[PDB]
């Protein structure tokens, strides 16, 4: 068999996006036959150059974890993606630390396969069209660029929040994400800020090709806004040498395979 | 409410250049500041911030929380969780004078560059 087009043939573009009937992961496993223990594909058809590692960070939102892999993994494949679907779960109930999360997935998924590209999404963002393709790109590639809740418009130039996507390259070249980030808000600029800095700059598909849909929820408990955002985000030239892939600790837990998705059960520590 | 941009700008535009900060400005200092929601409420800890401005308890609006506050704003805190914008911008140039830009940390972080996408172009 020969390598994938670089566009597949198989993409419907515009998708309509809802959240109404409920799920049940059993009837999505019946109509991914093709997807392995632990959320694992690979096309049969071609050769995918794309070895995709999908991270999501996690704590309590399985219900919202239901319909995005309802909807994600018809996309995935449409898309031609040799992927696996990695679920972070963080243990306890300290203050929610997404980006040690996302670093913990990468470490972990390396475990299981030769990624050489890491898509990161929120658990609640679905793309609206299968023509946003996620997978690593030339440059950081931001994915959910025209969010619902934001009015289907990017809500500033260098927003790097939602879904977001690093080759394993790129990831390793901005020392992966920070780990001192405890609570909502910031860590996705100190993200971009460290990509900035590596002088790469953020490729995104257009507005049209990059609609999001978002499933509305209540805020979560351990996820406040945090107050130290602003000063962190203001520093992370020199903190981001420091905090990082390099400064990494976390205790594994637990480990799941199911059949649509690898969920990893890590205690992260606390805020220090 | 979940305010717009240009609905912001055009509410607050009685503060351009206030204390030399222009509307460009205070349009990128909102969205992170409270993304534009009016009913925004949030701690640190031991005091919360309201509204579109994120004016604190701690010293300016007086909250039931907090009524030994000093209130340098002379107003309730509730007052700052509404649609009428008229008395947030007061108190928000009475932090301006006083404290100055820096009370909003997002500001220097988040708006000391690519101001023009903050332009409301709405007349
Ligand atoms: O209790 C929680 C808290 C967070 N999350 C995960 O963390 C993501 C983001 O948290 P929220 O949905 O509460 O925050 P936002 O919707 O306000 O998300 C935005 O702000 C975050 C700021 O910290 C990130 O930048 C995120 O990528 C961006 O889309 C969730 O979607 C989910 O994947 C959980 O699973 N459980
Ligand atoms: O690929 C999958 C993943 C999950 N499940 C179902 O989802 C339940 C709960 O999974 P998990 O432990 O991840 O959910 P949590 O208990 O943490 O809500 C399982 O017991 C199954 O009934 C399934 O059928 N297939
Ligand atoms: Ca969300
Ligand atoms: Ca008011």
Redesign the pocket.
């Known amino acids: 068999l020969t390598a994938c087009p670089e566009e597949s043939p198989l993409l419907v573009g515009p998708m309509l996006i809802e959240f109404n009937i409920p799920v049940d992961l059993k009837l999505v496993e019946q109509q991914n036959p093709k997807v392995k223990l632990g959320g694992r594909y690979t096309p049969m058809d071609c050769i995918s150059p794309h070895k995709v590692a999908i991270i999501?960070?996690?704590?309590?939102?399985q219900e919202?974890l239901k319909y995005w892999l309802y909807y994600l993994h018809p996309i995935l494949q449409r898309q031609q993606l040799d992927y696996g679907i990695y679920v972070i779960?963080?243990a306890g109930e300290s203050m929610?630390n997404?980006?040690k999360?996302l670093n913990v997935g990468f470490k972990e998924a390396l475990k299981d396969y030769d990624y050489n590209c890491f898509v990161?999404?929120?658990?609640?963002?679905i793309p609206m069209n299968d023509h946003n393709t996620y997978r690593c790109f030339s440059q950081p590639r931001h994915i959910?660029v025209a969010?619902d809740?934001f009015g289907f418009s990017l809500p500033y130039v260098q927003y790097?929040?939602?879904?977001?996507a690093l080759s394993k390259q790129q990831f390793l070249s901005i020392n992966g994400f920070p780990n001192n980030?405890w609570?909502?808000?910031?860590?996705?600029?100190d993200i971009y800020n460290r990509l900035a800095f590596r002088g790469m700059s953020v490729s995104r598909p257009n507005a049209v090709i990059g609609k999001t849909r978002?499933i509305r929820?209540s805020?979560?408990?351990?996820?406040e806004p945090?107050p130290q955002?602003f000063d962190r985000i203001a520093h992370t030239k020199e903190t981001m040498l420091s905090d990082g892939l390099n400064s990494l600790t976390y205790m594994v837990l637990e480990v799941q395979r199911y059949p649509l998705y690898t969920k990893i059960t890590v205690d992260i520590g606390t805020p220090s | 409410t979940e305010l717009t941009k240009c609905k912001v700008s055009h509410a607050i535009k009685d503060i351009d250049g206030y204390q030399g900060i222009s509307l460009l400005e205070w349009a990128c200092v909102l969205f992170h500041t409270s993304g534009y929601d009016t009913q925004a409420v949030v701690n640190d800890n031991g005091s919360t911030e309201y509204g579109l401005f994120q004016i604190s308890d701690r010293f300016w609006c007086k909250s039931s929380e907090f009524p030994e506050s000093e209130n340098i704003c002379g107003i309730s805190c509730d007052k700052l969780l509404d649609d009428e914008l008229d008395d947030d911008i007061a108190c928000a140039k009475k932090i301006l004078a006083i404290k100055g830009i820096d009370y909003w940390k997002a500001y220097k972080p988040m708006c000391s560059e690519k101001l023009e996408q903050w332009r409301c172009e709405k007349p």
């Open positions: 999501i960070p996690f704590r309590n939102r919202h779960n963080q929610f997404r980006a999360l990161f999404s929120d658990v609640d963002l959910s969010m809740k790097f929040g939602g879904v977001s980030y609570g909502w808000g910031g860590e996705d600029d978002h929820h805020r979560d408990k351990k996820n945090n955002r």
